[PDB]
Amino acid sequence: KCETIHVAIVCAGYNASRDVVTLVKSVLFHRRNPLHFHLIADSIAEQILATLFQTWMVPAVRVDFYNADELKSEVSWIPNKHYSGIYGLMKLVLTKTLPANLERVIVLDTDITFATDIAELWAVFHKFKGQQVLGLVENQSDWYLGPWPALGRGYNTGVILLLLDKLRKMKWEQMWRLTAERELMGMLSTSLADQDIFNAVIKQNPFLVYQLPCFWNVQLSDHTRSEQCYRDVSDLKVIHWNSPEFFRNLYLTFLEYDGNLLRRELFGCPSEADVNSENLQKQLSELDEDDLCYEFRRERFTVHRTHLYFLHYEYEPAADSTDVTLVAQLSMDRLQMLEAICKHWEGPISLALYLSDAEAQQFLRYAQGSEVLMSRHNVGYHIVYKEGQFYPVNLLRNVAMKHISTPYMFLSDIDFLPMYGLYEYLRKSVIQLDLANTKKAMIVPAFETLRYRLSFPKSKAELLSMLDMGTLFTFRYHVWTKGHAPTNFAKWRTATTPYRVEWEADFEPYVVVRRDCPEYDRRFVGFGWNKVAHIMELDVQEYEFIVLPNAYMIHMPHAPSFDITKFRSNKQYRICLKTLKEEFQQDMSRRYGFAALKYLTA
Amino acid sequence: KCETIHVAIVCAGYNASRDVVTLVKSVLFHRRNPLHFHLIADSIAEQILATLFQTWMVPAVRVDFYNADELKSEVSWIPNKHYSGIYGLMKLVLTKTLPANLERVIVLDTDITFATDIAELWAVFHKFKGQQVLGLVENQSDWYLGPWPALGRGYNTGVILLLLDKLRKMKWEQMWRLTAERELMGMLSTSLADQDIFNAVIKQNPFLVYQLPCFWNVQLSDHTRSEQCYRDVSDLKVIHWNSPEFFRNLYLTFLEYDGNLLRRELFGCPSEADVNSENLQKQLSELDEDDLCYEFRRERFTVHRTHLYFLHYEYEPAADSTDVTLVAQLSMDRLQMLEAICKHWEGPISLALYLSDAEAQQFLRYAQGSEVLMSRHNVGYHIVYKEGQFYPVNLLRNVAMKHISTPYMFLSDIDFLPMYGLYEYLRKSVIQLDLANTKKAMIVPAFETLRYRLSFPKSKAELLSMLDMGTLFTFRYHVWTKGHAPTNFAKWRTATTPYRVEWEADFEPYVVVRRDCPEYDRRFVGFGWNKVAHIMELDVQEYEFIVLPNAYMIHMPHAPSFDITKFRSNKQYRICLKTLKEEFQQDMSRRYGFAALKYLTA
Ligand SMILES: O=C(O)[C@H]1O[C@H](OP(=O)(O)OP(=O)(O)OC[C@H]2O[C@@H](n3ccc(=O)[nH]c3=O)[C@H](O)[C@@H]2O)[C@H](O)[C@@H](O)[C@@H]1O
Ligand SMILES: O=C(O)[C@H]1O[C@H](OP(=O)(O)OP(=O)(O)OC[C@H]2O[C@@H](n3ccc(=O)[nH]c3=O)[C@H](O)[C@@H]2O)[C@H](O)[C@@H](O)[C@@H]1O
Ligand SMILES: [Mn+2]
Ligand SMILES: [Mn+2]
């Protein structure tokens, strides 16, 4: 009843990571038995998938990872032309990689979707007889009908059933190696990668292959002409999207399905105790539900499913080791800023987007449909899926900061447009002020405007002229000047060299710091006191606040978010935010003692 | 295998409508057999549920409605104090209301959630023996332990299994009527409404009751103390939320589940042909997928699940029959306007919100947590659930217009704040201009501002002064003046009486019209040409555009929506919008002929 079903998936890259996320969602939507995933992945995919499954907390799912690079030398001698690359040749060597104590496994591809319970496919293992060990579905295309030799139409490696014990007893490694060498002696190339090799083995030993029903692998490829195979669309099971209305709706069902709905244990089967799940349960049990601020404390320890590098990412290390990454976080309603930011900052960017699955797909379509975003590869998109009622601003900031590729980071905001050439200016400033060997934070002055149509200045003199004419203002000039009052804009107007300032109450500048800067406090959600706590923690750790003369950023106006609108620092939210501020002050007093006394009167 | 399962639900009110939506979602998430819902509902709930199920298009679900008011006289003689009111006493008379050809039924309450397949509960009907006909779960509270007499702890009417044929053969009506009369001779009142009466029958004839397992009705009431009943939380089936962490997560699973995922047919069972579903399938099949504008044409005919009156609504007819309803539509990112609008317009408001299920719950929490929104009952919230990629602005406008309660409607916008007292001014203007007997549209001048902090003028003179100082501008003054150019603001500055204007190219004012105004064209989605087509249709039907002297509205600035940002009338969206404009012009030429020739050069 609770028999563990083992699924082996080969993943490599960010696109493959998204595809395997979709496949795992499809499998979990129909599962009824414990699942053990064996992910053969390179480091790029391994980090993403490990973080995703750690934060996902799916009950009765055990995930293990295997170094795909170590297997490259196993297939480095086989030329390949399939778009999956060398990683497509690794499904042959799974018997060498998977643990020796495993008997049966279901090998899948990243472009597979499940419309039925995977236990039904696992039950097919009971029907194997004789020496049949590879459960394969006959190819639905005329590719092998005349390519690599195959039996009949050939078999498709999109879904495979393997009996590892029998393959190991029969020395599958030597068999497939000899078959591949013999085929490559004349073919000299592979058209469909290891799949072709599979067919070659099927030619030599047809008795090893068990022909599964066609509806276990519905290949929607070009010129498929398989209408008879899926004539009964109601009873279709597994779909393969190998293409370079019901199917579209089914795909969109899982592509936009909420993954947090999968955090429910399997009935009748014990769930293994995970450290993160146990910690979350203990912390939530410690919280008092009678307290009026229960929601905020619950959101503080809430673990959000995080998908690092949601889009393709590339980066090259800086030769001078002084590179700076723009760090910001945003929700969906701020997407219009992104392109503008990409037009101002030419350096690496690390963003944390708080999107739902539907919003994640909308953002993916927007990014793939935008020339500006597709022309830039050094922008890191880390999607933190929505959960709870409040906006985890500090959690998003921590996610963005932790996954940068540069020694220094600028803790900017998505609503702020920087000046042109600020990237090179900060790269020079870190060398000039020697931030590597000192605890110094370089403050970038913040300005705000109320006009959407703005002629962005190309120099500091033009910015001063615009300030004189009343078009621009210092940030929060009309509401709360205490935030940037210690910036000393009056001295900044005529300053030609960076100058040090001192911390004051409610100070919250925008700082360029090192990679190892202390993290934000996750206890603050929504709007208010988010950056004040971080600036206080910076000051208590002996950080020197330095204002640069020739740097500035302008806060473009934005409609109030639902966070502000609902919890506009009034009534229950104001009381809870004051309580959180008091708790943070108490923790500051306890942790550092004498060095943190001056913040009590702040 | 495909046996039809009949579920009887009593619904009354908007809160009950939301609850029954949640219950239906919970039932459909676990169903495996055809479902036939019998909804005993009053007109208020009947309209909402009929529209919701018509737009929902759930396969293998047959919904029928029964007049609950006609049954009131059947229980008008029984005093009741339960918060469900007289509608709570109707479950007794279901045998009188349901069709005589039905044998077995499952009676549910609006506060029920299903965590297991309802076919499992329907299979319990096979286990009935003897004269046991009411499948009930013993009450889990000490309410009946000492109230109305009961057997043991009593039985809970949250979930009932009825054999209608046997009840009719045994004359259940007379039995329960006599039992209720005898009990009320001494009790004189009902504490738990018909439930108490049920228990009384259980006292007289205990052999009629079949005691279901406890986990078929898990009552989470106050002082429940039933930990033993749900000690195995993994294998819990039906939850009753009769209260005035796993349970919370389970409730939020269905409260925020996407209902459009339920539009999948049951495997192995034929689906009945519905007129709306057939029309949608035919229209989508007619559309060419090779056309680059496939998405827009698909969205044109897409049927969106509509939930009329998502919150409690009250209204009183105007004595003079000249009342005007502010009609507007908005998405989530415009919620901050609502309260402001409620501070300006004291009359009835009809709004159409394009929210997802999670966004619907967020809006419900915001509205229940806001004093301004809870103090106003004449605001109609019609939620149109998200589907597709584009914003159905015209569909939302049609939904808002069609469900107003007043003879006249103002086709305003959510981004526009009206002047104080505009409600009474328009109520006087409709009488002054005699819009009842003439085809006249009263134009309200539109202005825009770029400053979020605005001192709203209390008179026209102050508005003129603000215009002179450059603080305010006419709407789209800096971008596209053609939209409100025919408004003739120069004449409006000194005008003291309403004056007629003439239609011009791309004219798009904001008009007060009658209830029977022609609807918007649903072929336009996103942003662009949405109101131009409606104004052209108004002009081609001989509507006189009248500008009022002492009326104005100010367009508060807003961050660009994702619709503008992505499809900012550029590239593919611009081409598709131009194509839609051309098609609308062709339809205008064909439908009216000579009277529509002047729009070709527009
Ligand atoms: O730096 C500051 O001075 C202030 O910045 C924000 O306050 P504010 O800008 O008024 O409010 P938002 O516009 O909601 O916050 C801006 C930042 O939050 C993000 N954001 C986006 C969308 C959303 O709904 N909520 C939200 O907080 C934006 O992407 C951006 O990074 C913080 O919430 C304050 O705690 C802080 O004092
Ligand atoms: O009112 C008008 O005359 C014009 O409104 C919009 O032009 P614009 O104001 O630039 O764009 P929006 O800000 O999208 O229009 C305001 C309306 O759009 C609604 N809205 C809200 C949110 C959203 O995502 N999309 C959207 O269209 C708002 O609720 C409000 O009713 C349309 O693009 C024009 O076709 C229409 O004629
Ligand atoms: Mn901001
Ligand atoms: Mn607008």
JSON list of C-alpha atoms and ligand atoms in Angstrom, two decimals, chain B residues 327-334 352 354 391-394 396-397 411-416 475-476 483-484 506-510 524 526-533 555 558-564 573 577, ligand 2:
[
{"chain": "B", "resi": 327, "resn": "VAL", "atom": "CA", "xyz": [-20.44, 51.78, -12.43]},
{"chain": "B", "resi": 328, "resn": "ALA", "atom": "CA", "xyz": [-16.75, 50.91, -12.47]},
{"chain": "B", "resi": 329, "resn": "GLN", "atom": "CA", "xyz": [-14.42, 47.95, -12.81]},
{"chain": "B", "resi": 330, "resn": "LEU", "atom": "CA", "xyz": [-11.02, 47.36, -11.25]},
{"chain": "B", "resi": 331, "resn": "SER", "atom": "CA", "xyz": [-8.29, 44.81, -10.68]},
{"chain": "B", "resi": 332, "resn": "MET", "atom": "CA", "xyz": [-6.54, 44.09, -7.38]},
{"chain": "B", "resi": 333, "resn": "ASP", "atom": "CA", "xyz": [-3.87, 46.79, -7.78]},
{"chain": "B", "resi": 334, "resn": "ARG", "atom": "CA", "xyz": [-6.62, 49.46, -7.69]},
{"chain": "B", "resi": 352, "resn": "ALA", "atom": "CA", "xyz": [-16.57, 44.31, -11.12]},
{"chain": "B", "resi": 354, "resn": "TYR", "atom": "CA", "xyz": [-11.05, 40.72, -11.74]},
{"chain": "B", "resi": 391, "resn": "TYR", "atom": "CA", "xyz": [-7.63, 42.03, -18.97]},
{"chain": "B", "resi": 392, "resn": "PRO", "atom": "CA", "xyz": [-11.35, 41.70, -19.92]},
{"chain": "B", "resi": 393, "resn": "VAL", "atom": "CA", "xyz": [-12.18, 45.37, -19.41]},
{"chain": "B", "resi": 394, "resn": "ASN", "atom": "CA", "xyz": [-15.31, 45.31, -21.57]},
{"chain": "B", "resi": 396, "resn": "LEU", "atom": "CA", "xyz": [-16.11, 43.54, -16.54]},
{"chain": "B", "resi": 397, "resn": "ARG", "atom": "CA", "xyz": [-17.94, 46.70, -17.61]},
{"chain": "B", "resi": 411, "resn": "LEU", "atom": "CA", "xyz": [-20.01, 54.63, -16.59]},
{"chain": "B", "resi": 412, "resn": "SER", "atom": "CA", "xyz": [-17.14, 55.97, -14.51]},
{"chain": "B", "resi": 413, "resn": "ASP", "atom": "CA", "xyz": [-13.65, 54.52, -13.91]},
{"chain": "B", "resi": 414, "resn": "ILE", "atom": "CA", "xyz": [-11.96, 53.29, -10.71]},
{"chain": "B", "resi": 415, "resn": "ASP", "atom": "CA", "xyz": [-9.08, 55.76, -11.20]},
{"chain": "B", "resi": 416, "resn": "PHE", "atom": "CA", "xyz": [-11.42, 58.78, -11.17]},
{"chain": "B", "resi": 475, "resn": "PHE", "atom": "CA", "xyz": [-7.41, 64.30, -18.68]},
{"chain": "B", "resi": 476, "resn": "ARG", "atom": "CA", "xyz": [-4.68, 63.09, -21.06]},
{"chain": "B", "resi": 483, "resn": "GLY", "atom": "CA", "xyz": [-9.79, 61.75, -26.15]},
{"chain": "B", "resi": 484, "resn": "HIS", "atom": "CA", "xyz": [-11.45, 64.71, -24.42]},
{"chain": "B", "resi": 506, "resn": "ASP", "atom": "CA", "xyz": [-11.43, 58.95, -30.78]},
{"chain": "B", "resi": 507, "resn": "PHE", "atom": "CA", "xyz": [-13.93, 60.72, -28.52]},
{"chain": "B", "resi": 508, "resn": "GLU", "atom": "CA", "xyz": [-14.29, 58.90, -25.19]},
{"chain": "B", "resi": 509, "resn": "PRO", "atom": "CA", "xyz": [-16.01, 60.84, -22.39]},
{"chain": "B", "resi": 510, "resn": "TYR", "atom": "CA", "xyz": [-17.50, 59.50, -19.15]},
{"chain": "B", "resi": 524, "resn": "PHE", "atom": "CA", "xyz": [-11.35, 44.39, -26.92]},
{"chain": "B", "resi": 526, "resn": "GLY", "atom": "CA", "xyz": [-6.14, 44.80, -22.26]},
{"chain": "B", "resi": 527, "resn": "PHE", "atom": "CA", "xyz": [-5.86, 48.60, -22.68]},
{"chain": "B", "resi": 528, "resn": "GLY", "atom": "CA", "xyz": [-6.93, 50.58, -25.77]},
{"chain": "B", "resi": 529, "resn": "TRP", "atom": "CA", "xyz": [-9.98, 51.52, -27.86]},
{"chain": "B", "resi": 530, "resn": "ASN", "atom": "CA", "xyz": [-12.14, 50.08, -25.08]},
{"chain": "B", "resi": 531, "resn": "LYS", "atom": "CA", "xyz": [-14.38, 53.13, -24.58]},
{"chain": "B", "resi": 532, "resn": "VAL", "atom": "CA", "xyz": [-13.98, 54.50, -28.12]},
{"chain": "B", "resi": 533, "resn": "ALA", "atom": "CA", "xyz": [-16.04, 51.64, -29.55]},
{"chain": "B", "resi": 555, "resn": "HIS", "atom": "CA", "xyz": [-8.07, 60.98, -12.58]},
{"chain": "B", "resi": 558, "resn": "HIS", "atom": "CA", "xyz": [-1.55, 55.20, -10.94]},
{"chain": "B", "resi": 559, "resn": "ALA", "atom": "CA", "xyz": [1.43, 53.00, -11.69]},
{"chain": "B", "resi": 560, "resn": "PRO", "atom": "CA", "xyz": [1.16, 51.33, -15.11]},
{"chain": "B", "resi": 561, "resn": "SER", "atom": "CA", "xyz": [-0.58, 47.97, -14.89]},
{"chain": "B", "resi": 562, "resn": "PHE", "atom": "CA", "xyz": [1.00, 44.77, -16.16]},
{"chain": "B", "resi": 563, "resn": "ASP", "atom": "CA", "xyz": [-1.38, 45.02, -19.11]},
{"chain": "B", "resi": 564, "resn": "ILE", "atom": "CA", "xyz": [0.07, 48.36, -20.21]},
{"chain": "B", "resi": 573, "resn": "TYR", "atom": "CA", "xyz": [-0.44, 43.94, -29.26]},
{"chain": "B", "resi": 577, "resn": "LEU", "atom": "CA", "xyz": [-5.54, 46.07, -31.47]},
{"chain": "C", "resi": 2, "resn": "LIG", "atom": "O1", "xyz": [-11.06, 55.48, -19.69]},
{"chain": "C", "resi": 2, "resn": "LIG", "atom": "C1", "xyz": [-10.77, 55.49, -20.86]},
{"chain": "C", "resi": 2, "resn": "LIG", "atom": "O2", "xyz": [-11.33, 56.23, -21.63]},
{"chain": "C", "resi": 2, "resn": "LIG", "atom": "C2", "xyz": [-9.67, 54.58, -21.36]},
{"chain": "C", "resi": 2, "resn": "LIG", "atom": "O3", "xyz": [-9.18, 53.77, -20.29]},
{"chain": "C", "resi": 2, "resn": "LIG", "atom": "C3", "xyz": [-7.99, 53.08, -20.64]},
{"chain": "C", "resi": 2, "resn": "LIG", "atom": "O4", "xyz": [-6.94, 53.99, -20.84]},
{"chain": "C", "resi": 2, "resn": "LIG", "atom": "P1", "xyz": [-5.96, 54.37, -19.63]},
{"chain": "C", "resi": 2, "resn": "LIG", "atom": "O5", "xyz": [-6.70, 55.24, -18.67]},
{"chain": "C", "resi": 2, "resn": "LIG", "atom": "O6", "xyz": [-4.68, 54.90, -20.20]},
{"chain": "C", "resi": 2, "resn": "LIG", "atom": "O7", "xyz": [-5.69, 52.94, -18.96]},
{"chain": "C", "resi": 2, "resn": "LIG", "atom": "P2", "xyz": [-6.15, 52.25, -17.59]},
{"chain": "C", "resi": 2, "resn": "LIG", "atom": "O8", "xyz": [-5.48, 52.95, -16.45]},
{"chain": "C", "resi": 2, "resn": "LIG", "atom": "O9", "xyz": [-5.96, 50.77, -17.71]},
{"chain": "C", "resi": 2, "resn": "LIG", "atom": "O10", "xyz": [-7.71, 52.59, -17.57]},
{"chain": "C", "resi": 2, "resn": "LIG", "atom": "C4", "xyz": [-8.39, 52.80, -16.31]},
{"chain": "C", "resi": 2, "resn": "LIG", "atom": "C5", "xyz": [-9.34, 51.66, -16.07]},
{"chain": "C", "resi": 2, "resn": "LIG", "atom": "O11", "xyz": [-8.66, 50.40, -16.31]},
{"chain": "C", "resi": 2, "resn": "LIG", "atom": "C6", "xyz": [-8.96, 49.50, -15.26]},
{"chain": "C", "resi": 2, "resn": "LIG", "atom": "N1", "xyz": [-7.84, 48.54, -15.08]},
{"chain": "C", "resi": 2, "resn": "LIG", "atom": "C7", "xyz": [-7.38, 48.25, -13.82]},
{"chain": "C", "resi": 2, "resn": "LIG", "atom": "C8", "xyz": [-6.38, 47.38, -13.59]},
{"chain": "C", "resi": 2, "resn": "LIG", "atom": "C9", "xyz": [-5.77, 46.71, -14.70]},
{"chain": "C", "resi": 2, "resn": "LIG", "atom": "O12", "xyz": [-4.85, 45.90, -14.63]},
{"chain": "C", "resi": 2, "resn": "LIG", "atom": "N2", "xyz": [-6.28, 47.05, -15.94]},
{"chain": "C", "resi": 2, "resn": "LIG", "atom": "C10", "xyz": [-7.30, 47.93, -16.20]},
{"chain": "C", "resi": 2, "resn": "LIG", "atom": "O13", "xyz": [-7.68, 48.15, -17.34]},
{"chain": "C", "resi": 2, "resn": "LIG", "atom": "C11", "xyz": [-9.18, 50.38, -14.04]},
{"chain": "C", "resi": 2, "resn": "LIG", "atom": "O14", "xyz": [-9.97, 49.68, -13.10]},
{"chain": "C", "resi": 2, "resn": "LIG", "atom": "C12", "xyz": [-9.94, 51.56, -14.66]},
{"chain": "C", "resi": 2, "resn": "LIG", "atom": "O15", "xyz": [-11.34, 51.31, -14.70]},
{"chain": "C", "resi": 2, "resn": "LIG", "atom": "C13", "xyz": [-8.16, 52.22, -21.90]},
{"chain": "C", "resi": 2, "resn": "LIG", "atom": "O16", "xyz": [-6.88, 51.81, -22.37]},
{"chain": "C", "resi": 2, "resn": "LIG", "atom": "C14", "xyz": [-8.91, 52.94, -23.01]},
{"chain": "C", "resi": 2, "resn": "LIG", "atom": "O17", "xyz": [-9.29, 52.02, -24.03]},
{"chain": "C", "resi": 2, "resn": "LIG", "atom": "C15", "xyz": [-10.15, 53.61, -22.45]},
{"chain": "C", "resi": 2, "resn": "LIG", "atom": "O18", "xyz": [-10.85, 54.31, -23.47]}
]
